[PDB]
Each structure stands twice: as C-alpha cells, then as structure tokens.
Write a protein that binds this ligand. Structure first.
Ligand SMILES: [Zn+2]
Lengths: 94, 39, 286, 50, 287, 139, 191
C-alpha cells in the first residue's frame, strides 16, 4: 500500500494494525525476513524499518489502469530526453 | 586550442610535386622484371 | 543450459538465396532448413546450413513434410566434406512464429538434443537485430497442464570470424562509420539505444491492450515482473544520490580540465614548429 | 593382384617430403616461430585441427 | 572468337564459400565445383559454389567423383532449381595466382566437356580487406602459340586495365592462358541486411563501466602521464640544435613524449566524456 | 578513402615470414638488417612501425622475397628459457655446504646483495661488480 | 517407362490390432504391400515407394525411397494402436505427392482403411472434388473390421471417378479373416 515515496513504517503502526505488543513485532519481522517474503532493514532506536522489496501479489483489471498511467508519462520522459539527443547531437553524425 | 589550429594554416605552401617512384627506374624495373620472368 | 548463440553472415545469406530460389511460389512458403554447427563451452555456434523442401497448406495447418532422405544424404555429404561440422538445430524463415514450429522441433529432436530453431528476417527493417533463436522448454505448472513445451528466446548475436571478415568487409566498400572517438558511442547507443528502450517500452503498452477488449488470459504470470519494475523504479534526486553525483562529476571534470589544458599547449608547440618552417623558408627560397 | 600391388605405386608417387623443424615459441594462436635444421628462423602457422 | 572483354559476373555468396572452404583447409590446395548460370559468348555468371571433399593426404587439385557431383548435382535439383556447371576452382594458399602444371591438366579435362569452363584461383591469405585476388583464368591454345598467331583479338578497352603479377608472368600467364576481368553482383536487399546486422551494440552505452575503476583507471593513466610530461620537459630543450632531421634519425631508440602524450590525452578524453554523459541520461530517463 | 588504403598495405605481412636482425639505419625510413641466412642486406621499411621500438639488436621480420622490413618482434632465445623454477631447483641448501663462510658470504655480497640493496651501492656509490669469475682445483 | 510414383498409405489405426486375419493383420497387409511393390517395381523401375499413414499421428515412417527394406523394417513393430484420422489422410497424401521429385509422374495412391471412419462426407466430398480438380486416381482397399458396406467410401470413390475419370475403384473388405493377397489380387491385375 505504501508508495515509493516512503514505504517506511513504524512499530507503533504495527502495534496498531496487528494489535500485537511492542516486544513481539521484532521477532515477527525478523521471521518475515528469515522466510524472505519481504526484504528490508531494521532500525531499533527510531522504531522504524526500511522495507524495500515485497512479495509480489495479484491484481484485477483496475490496477492495470494505474500501471498504464505510470507507463504513460514514462514514455514521454524517454521522448523528451531523447529529443535533446536527436536535436543537439544532429551535426555530429547525419 | 582551436585558434591554435586555425592559425596553423599559414605554413602550408610549396608542396608541388609528389613523385610516386620514378619513370625510368620503373621502365628498368619492367626490363629486369621481364628478364627475371624470362628466366 | 545454452548461454548464447553465434550466427555467421554465410548462413545469414544462405537462408536468403534459398528464399530467392523458392521466390517464384509467391503465395506462401516458409523457408525451413537444417541448421548446422557446433557448440563449445556452452556457447552455441552456427556456421553452415541448407534448406529442406517444405510445403504446407492453410486448411488443416498441421500437415508438414521433411524429406529425411534429403536430410541424411546431404548431411552425410557435409559430414564427408567436413567431419568437424555437424548438426546444431534447425531454422525457419520466421515472420511471426508459425504454428507448426511446436512440433517441427519435436519432429527432429532425435538429431540434436538441444535442437534449436532460428527465426530470421527477409524484409530487413528494425532498430535492433532481426536475428532470433528460441529453445525448447517444458515445465508443468499450477495453471495449465502437462505438455508445456513452450519456446524461450535465448539471447542472440552475430558472431564474426577472421576468415569471413576479409570477404565481408570487401563486400561492403560502401559506408563504414569508423573513426571511433566519442561519436561511435554517441550514435550506436546514446542515439540508438534510447530508441532501443522505446520499443521495449512500447511492447508492454501493446500487451496493455487487454483492459476490457483484448484476449482472455488476464494476469497470473505477467504482473509479478511489472510489479518488480515499478518496485524497481530507482532513487529520486534528494537523499544522497545528488551528493555522490556532484562528488564524482566534480572529480571527472578535473581530468577533463587537465587533458583540455595540455592539448592547446601541444598545438601551440606545433605552431612554433610551423613558424620556424615559414620564416626560414621565405628568405631561403625567395 | 598384380594391378593392385602395382596400383599402390600409381598414387604413392605424389607424397612430397616435409621439412624437419623445431618449435621455438608461440606468439599468438596462429603465429608460430620455428627454425629448421638448415639455417634461418621462420614465422609460420599450423593447421587448425592439429 | 573472344574479345578479351569477358566480364565475369559472380555473386555475393560464392566468394564467402571460396574463403571459408579455402581457409579451413589452408595448407592443402583445396578445390570444389562452381554451379552457375551460363550466358553468352561475352559474359558468364556463376551464382553458386559447392566444394568437394578431398582424396587423401597430399597437396593437389586431384580428381573428381562424378558419383558425388552426380547425386550432389541432383541434390538441389529436387529442392531448388537446376543450374549449369560453369566452372571450378582451386586454392593457392600463400602463392598468388597462376596455373600450375597440375592445374592445367585438370583444367584441360574440364574445358573438353564445355569450352567455357572457368579455372578460378582464390588466395584467401594474401587478402586483408580490399583484396580477394580472384584472378580467374582459362587456357589459351599452345597450338596457336606454335602458329605464332596472337590470340583473343582485342576489340574493347576493357581487358588491359589491371596489371599482371610478376609471379604469374613467371608462370604461364600469357603463354598458356589469359586473364579475365570480374566485378560483383550486388543488390539493395543483402547490403542492408549485412550492414545493420554486423556490429550493433545492444544496450552497452546505457551502462556505467565499472564505477569504482573508471576514476581509478583515470588515475592509472595520469600517474605516468606526469613523468611522460617530464619527458616533455626534456625533449623541448634540445631544439635550436642539430638539424631536426637529425632529431628524426636520432629518435629511433627512445620514445618521444609528443605522440605518446597526445595519445593519452585522447584516451582520457574519450574515456571520461562518454561515461560522463552516459551517467547523466539515466538520471532523467529513470525517474 | 584514406582509411581504406591505410589498412591495405599489410598484405605483405601475412604468413610466410623470415627473420633477420636490425643493425642500423642509413637515414629516415631505410635501414640495414642482418638476415639469419647469414648475409646482410640493404632493405626498406614498413611505414606504420613505431621507429622508437628499435635500435639495439632488434629481432625483425623480413619478407621472404622482396626482403624488406615487416614487423618487430617480442624477444626470444634458445633452450635456456629462464630455468622454469618448478622442476628446476637443484634441491641444495646453504647448510649442505659446510666450511665455506668466506666464499659463500663473499658471493652473497657479490651477487644478490646488489640485486636487493641496490640503492646503497648507488648511494654510497662503490661501483658494484658486473661479472664474477670463480676457479680452483676441481671438486 | 511410364511416369508414376507409387505411394502406399498404410493402416496403423487401432482397428488392425488383433490376429484374427490369419498370421497377423499387419503381416497380411505388409506382405500385400511387398508383392504389389514387387509388381510395380518389377513392372516399372522408375518408381520410389514410401509409406505414410492415416492415424492420429500421420508420420512419414518412410521417406519416399526406391527401396522396400526400410518399409519392411518400419512395418515390423509398426505399432498399430492409434485413432484413425482419415480427413487429414488426403492432405498428408497429396501434399507429399506435391513434394515429389517429379510431378511429371502420375499421381497414384493406394489407401488402406481397416477401421470405422468418422469423417464428414461433406469434408471428403470437398477433398473428393478437390481431387477432381487435381487429377489423382486412388484405389482404396479396405481391411479389418469396418462399418460394413463401407460408410462414405462408396460416396467418396463415387465422387472421385466421376467426370470422365471412371478408372478408380473401391475394394471393400470381405469380412472373413482370410489371406489378404487374394483379397488384393484385383488391383494388382487391373487398377
Ligand atoms: Zn594451383
């Protein structure tokens, strides 16, 4: 759910959404890393974890609209940056 | 650098005759070559 | 098991001339032939080939024919003229992956264990390499059945040879974008490679043609990889990605400044070498 | 049998002799350097199967 | 009669067959057959070439197996299209181009069948890029040589254009045979599909080239470039001295800083700028 | 067009190559070799060779007929290749020789002590010896 | 001599599996093929004889060859356990006859059906009028057990020999397990 903006959650939030206490969530997430469904790092003092890689899931015909839209401007990024190469690098090789 | 390249175009002169090898030495090469093939 | 393949211009033309000598059929014919070669160090090689006679009718498009007498006699002749050369697989002319090429490979798997196919081009246009090779792989899964012999494209490239480079480069004499300074990188990959990423960008857009209108398989095995793409979007320009970038650009332009610094001194010394050639020639000759 | 035992000598009189040489070192895969029991040192290649 | 203006058209594939089979069996004079498309008294065309396996150990042009050229002649007959045996070849390895006394006899056996069989010499070893040395020949009549009659009746300024090699002039050349001019049949269709298909880098310039060791190698040139620049602080100081042609004959034992310097300047330049720009396209294209 | 003919010159350089030795040059781009056939010759060069890769007793390559310079060679010598160091030690220790302290310590000074501690011979400058002669009754 | 190319279509369908037909069904039809290829071979040497089948998998067990010893080796343990597919039999026959070294040769096929067929008579009348448009004479000989009073085959040969063709025949099976050589003694004498 969390975007690539942060995708960094806290043990207070784990204790909120899983309603399991503070001294069990570390064993839970280390078990998750030991299984390897998730790949991330553990900070203890700021009570946050930098979860990076998730186990991939399935989705319906609605999320392909969002992946379509994220594909969409990613096309014209390549168009827009490549047009500088074609325009400016034209006189080097015809 | 480029101005030291554009200003380096004032010495090029008197490059008149680019003789390949010769004419008479080419003819004697044809004569001695014809003798060596004749042998 | 197979790393990559090596394709020669001799076999590359050797499909095309046969395509011309069957070119009078006009209507429809794929050029199926026997691919010959070796493989060493798990690196596939293709050096020679020929083409088996082959016809196929559109109605009941599962009726194919390979003259195995033409296989055995001509391969016996090629073994006789070259015992080093042997079978390596097969090929077909490959516009768009014909259907009988699910069991052509099964028809002649008894010759080569990795009986490889090669898809070529007869109408040459792309922004890449129009050379293709799959491999036969069967893997029963939890979303189908048993017989799952699908084809998987092993990566491909045109390999060279010291024998053939002389005659091939004689057969150009036309245009050759050598003098590799920076321009060869700038054009073969900084211009060309971005348009290489254009088509691979565009291909999943062509798959995205199933939102409500396309074919029946929805997701299953297409979205873990794309989910890993958008998972694998790189880091934004805020965290430390800026700082090490200005660090190492800040180191690279030092060396660029050194080389550009010395180059002008070189040309200056040459200009001194030219004015000595001027001033002691104008008075001497007259 | 008289045509065969004499037919050995028909094609048997084509084998041209070979120079006895000695390998000095190897420059590249095809560049070899030798010297015969005669005189000067040469630069030479091999068959690609040997 | 012929007009010494024959102008053999050949191919694009047959030369590749000639260099491959002539190259893989290099020290033996290998050979084979030439299955072409025969045209008029003036020109002749040869589009296809199939080789022949050897007879035994020994450098020779040898013989033919008409069983093998029979079934091999009937092999592509049932699959592709029929053609006509227009000639043949052999392969001088490191020699040049002529007809040996062995070559002229098996030539003489082949002109007897068809008078326009072609003796073809390839030499794929004295060739580098713009060289093939495909000087194909054919016999001239020693009977007419005994007659003293000069043959071949030049009616066109097309024959005496190339100049013959002195080694062929040592051999038969103009006492037993004759030279033939050739060219190459090209199209559009093959030229593009070799041009776009020879050396295409896939996604290589969209990489970073060993990001620890790009700058480390950049050090690894500059470090000795310093002392080479000390040699450039050494070699200037013998100017206004003995006649710089003496500075040309004299610098044949020890290196000059000049050419060696401008080498490394170019190497560091093209080494750095490509990695610099290629490092920066990805920051825009990738998010 | 120039780059086509630029590579074209090396048809002479291909396989059937004979070996001489460089002796000296008359002038720019024309020199004198000593063939391994025994006889000396006045020969021509090939242009693309770096001329600063020559001038000692350079082993050079010669064309077998035209007899001109072709290519310079990496060095090469006869059967004494380096004493191959694996199955080549005479397996003898310093303790195997008893009662030779003066001569063993002295040749220790003579050979390998300049080989390692060269900068003391350079810095004090005592002209280290070039070669050594050793002799006596046999055994 | 006369230009033809003898192409037999063997029967490795599942309805030829037992040994009620004397020695073996396979051996009876096999030796029938042997003596008719002695007849066609010893009548005309310009004939290569290959064997194809009309089963589920219509394999070219023998590529079209002028020897029958390979035909012997393949018809030995030929494994006649397979579902009949005769509708692709016409395509796998005539397309192979278009693969031949000489189409100047007369297109002659014999076909062996010792099995109940599950074709459409519309399909074999499309292929039958196709053979009317392709000038091929086929004498289909029937073996084994079958749908007796052969279903769609009389309509097939009837829609084959029409329009002045009238030289093709249908040898239906006599349902007695006898020696099949006398059963095939008619087309070897007159096709
Ligand atoms: Zn020869």
């Amino acid at each position: 759910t969390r975007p690539a903006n942060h995708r960094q959650l806290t043990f207070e939030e784990i204790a909120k959404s899983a309603k399991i206490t503070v001294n069990e969530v570390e064993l839970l997430v280390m078990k998750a890393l030991s299984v390897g469904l998730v790949k991330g790092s553990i900070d203890e003092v700021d009570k946050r974890v930098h979860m990076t890689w998730v186990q991939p899931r399935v989705l319906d015909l609605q999320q392909i609209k969002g992946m379509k839209d994220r594909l969409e401007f990613w096309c014209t990024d390549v168009k827009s940056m490549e047009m500088l190469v074609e325009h400016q690098a034209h006189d080097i090789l015809t | 650098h480029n101005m030291s390249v554009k200003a380096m175009r004032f010495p090029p002169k008197s490059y008149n005759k680019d003789l390949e090898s010769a004419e008479e030495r080419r003819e004697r090469e044809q004569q001695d070559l014809e003798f060596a093939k004749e042998m | 098991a197979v790393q990559k393949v090596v394709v020669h211009p001799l076999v590359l033309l050797s499909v095309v001339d046969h395509f011309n000598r069957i070119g009078k059929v006009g209507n429809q014919k794929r050029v199926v032939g026997v691919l010959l070669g070796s493989w060493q160090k798990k690196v596939l090689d293709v050096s020679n080939s020929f083409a088996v006679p082959f016809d196929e009718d559109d109605k009941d498009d599962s009726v194919w024919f390979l003259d195995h007498d033409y296989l055995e006699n001509m391969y016996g002749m090629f073994k006789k003229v070259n015992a080093r050369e042997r079978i390596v697989g097969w090929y077909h002319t490959g516009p768009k992956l014909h259907k009988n090429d699910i069991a052509i490979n099964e028809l002649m798997k008894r010759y080569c264990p990795n009986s490889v196919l090669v898809i070529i081009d007869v109408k040459p246009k792309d922004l890449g390499l129009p050379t293709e090779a799959y491999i036969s792989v069967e893997e029963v899964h939890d979303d189908g059945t048993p017989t799952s012999k699908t084809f998987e494209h092993v990566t491909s490239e045109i390999g060279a040879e010291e024998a053939e480079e002389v005659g091939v480069e004689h057969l150009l004499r036309d245009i050759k974008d050598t003098t590799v300074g920076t321009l060869s990188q700038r054009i073969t990959n900084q211009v060309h490679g971005l348009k290489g990423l254009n088509s691979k960008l565009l291909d999943i857009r062509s798959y995205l043609e199933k939102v409500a209108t396309g074919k029946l398989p929805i997701n299953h095995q297409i979205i873990y990889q794309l989910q890993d793409v958008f998972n694998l979007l790189p880091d934004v320009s805020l965290q430390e990605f800026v700082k090490a970038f200005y660090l190492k650009t800040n180191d690279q332009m030092v060396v660029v400044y050194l080389a550009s610094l010395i180059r002008s001194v070189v040309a200056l010394h040459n200009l001194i070498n030219n004015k000595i050639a001027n001033r002691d020639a104008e008075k001497k000759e007259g | 049998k008289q045509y065969e035992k004499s037919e050995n000598d028909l094609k048997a009189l084509q084998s041209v002799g070979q120079i006895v040489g000695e390998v000095l070192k190897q420059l590249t895969e095809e560049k070899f350097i030798v010297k015969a029991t005669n005189g000067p040192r040469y630069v030479v290649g091999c068959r690609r199967q040997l | 009669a012929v007009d010494t203006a024959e102008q053999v058209y050949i191919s694009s594939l047959a030369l590749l067959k000639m260099l491959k089979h002539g190259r893989a069996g290099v020290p033996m004079e290998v050979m084979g057959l030439m299955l072409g498309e025969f045209v008029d008294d003036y020109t002749v065309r040869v589009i296809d070439v199939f080789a022949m396996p050897q007879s035994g150990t020994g450098v020779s042009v040898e013989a033919v197996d008409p069983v093998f050229q029979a079934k091999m002649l009937d092999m592509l007959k049932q699959t592709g299209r029929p053609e006509m045996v227009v000639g043949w070849y052999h392969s001088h390895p490191g020699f040049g181009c002529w007809l040996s006394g062995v070559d002229i006899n098996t030539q003489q056996s082949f002109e007897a069948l068809s008078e326009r069989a072609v003796a073809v010499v390839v030499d794929p070893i004295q060739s580098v890029k713009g060289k093939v040395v495909i000087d194909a020949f054919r016999l001239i009549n020693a009977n007419m040589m005994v007659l003293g009659h000069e043959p071949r009746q030049t009616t066109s300024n097309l024959g005496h254009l190339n100049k013959p090699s002195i080694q062929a002039l040592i051999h038969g050349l103009n006492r037993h045979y004759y030279s033939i001019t050739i060219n190459y049949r090209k199209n559009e269709l093959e030229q593009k599909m070799l041009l776009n298909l020879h050396k295409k880098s896939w996604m290589e310039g969209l990489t970073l080239q060993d990001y620890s060791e790009h700058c480390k190698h950049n050090e690894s040139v500059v470090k000795e470039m310093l002392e080479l620049a000390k040699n450039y602080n050494k070699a200037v100081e013998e100017e206004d001295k003995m006649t710089p042609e003496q500075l040309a004959i004299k610098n044949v034992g020890k290196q000059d800083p000049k050419r060696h310097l401008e080498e490394h300047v170019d190497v560091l330049m093209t080494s750095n700028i490509v990695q610099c720009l290629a490092a920066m396209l990805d920051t825009v294209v990738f998010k | 067009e120039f780059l086509h003919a630029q590579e074209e010159v090396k048809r002479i350089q291909s396989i059937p190559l004979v070996i001489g030795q460089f002796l000296e040059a008359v002038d720019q781009n024309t020199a004198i070799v000593g063939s391994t056939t025994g006889s000396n010759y006045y020969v021509r060069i090939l242009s693309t060779i770096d001329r600063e890769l020559l001038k000692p007793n350079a082993s050079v390559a010669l064309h077998k007929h035209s007899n001109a310079l072709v290519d310079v060679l990496p060095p090469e010598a006869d059967s004494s290749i380096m004493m191959l160091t694996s199955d080549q030690k005479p397996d003898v220790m310093y303790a195997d020789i008893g009662g030779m302290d003066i001569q063993k310590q002295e040749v220790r000074e003579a050979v390998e002590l300049p080989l390692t501690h060269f900068e003391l011979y350079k810095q004090i400058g005592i002209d280290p010896p070039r070669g050594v002669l050793m002799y006596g009754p046999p055994g | 001599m006369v230009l033809e190319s003898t192409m037999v279509c063997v029967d490795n369908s599942e309805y030829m599996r037992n040994g009620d037909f004397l020695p073996t069904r396979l051996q009876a039809q096999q030796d029938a093929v042997n003596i008719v290829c002695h007849s066609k071979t010893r009548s005309n040497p310009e004939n290569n004889v290959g064997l194809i089948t009309l089963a589920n998998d219509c394999e070219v067990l023998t590529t079209l060859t002028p020897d029958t010893g390979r035909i012997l080796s393949k018809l030995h343990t030929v494994q006649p356990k397979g579902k009949i597919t005769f509708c692709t039999g016409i395509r796998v026959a005539h397309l192979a006859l278009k693969h031949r070294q000489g189409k100047n040769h007369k297109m002659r096929i014999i076909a062996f059906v010792g099995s109940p067929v599950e074709d459409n008579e519309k399909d074999l009348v499309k292929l039958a009028k196709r053979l009317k448009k392709e000038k091929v004479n086929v004498d289909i000989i029937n073996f084994g057990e079958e749908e007796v009073n052969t279903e769609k085959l009389t309509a097939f040969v009837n829609t084959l020999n029409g329009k002045d063709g009238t030289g093709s025949h249908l040898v239906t099976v006599p349902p007695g397990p006898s020696l099949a050589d006398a059963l095939i003694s008619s087309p070897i004498l007159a096709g």
